[PDB]
């Protein structure tokens, strides 16, 4: 599995970070609980996934009890077998876990992330402080489909997208 910012094999599934590995964490750029994510992912990949092999880890984003990795599908790898190791990482970690293909379109990762919950639509808004904003609609009715607090998920879309990100009820 590639790594947009590569740590060893050895290291990963040893715990025991090499100089260069250990800089990633002591810097800020990796966070310890990612090793342990990359870790299930690169076991996952001997046996059970080997889809993994030309897949992408972005990163990971961790708020209250939502794990979302950011990944690039291999050219076999499907949204099914993401969901089986969703399920997997889920266990393991006992946390909840959304997936999301890293795309441009904030339309697109917001119809993952938010899934089960439907996106009615996305609206652009221009703010007087020269900014721009996306705006999600979802439906009042889906508020128990949201894997997570609608504003948990605001700001991580807004992470992801590097650009503000709201999500509205209607
Ligand atoms: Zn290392």
Redesign the pocket.
Known sequence: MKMKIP??Y??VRSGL??N??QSLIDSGEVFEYEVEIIKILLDLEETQFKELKDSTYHKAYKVDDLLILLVTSGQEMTQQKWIKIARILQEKLNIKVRVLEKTNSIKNSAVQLLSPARVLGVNTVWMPDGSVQYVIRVSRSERRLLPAEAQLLESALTKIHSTPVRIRVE
Do not use: A, I, P
Request: hydrophobic share 40%; with cysteine; charged share 25%.
């Open positions: 740590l060893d050895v290291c970070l090499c260069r590995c």
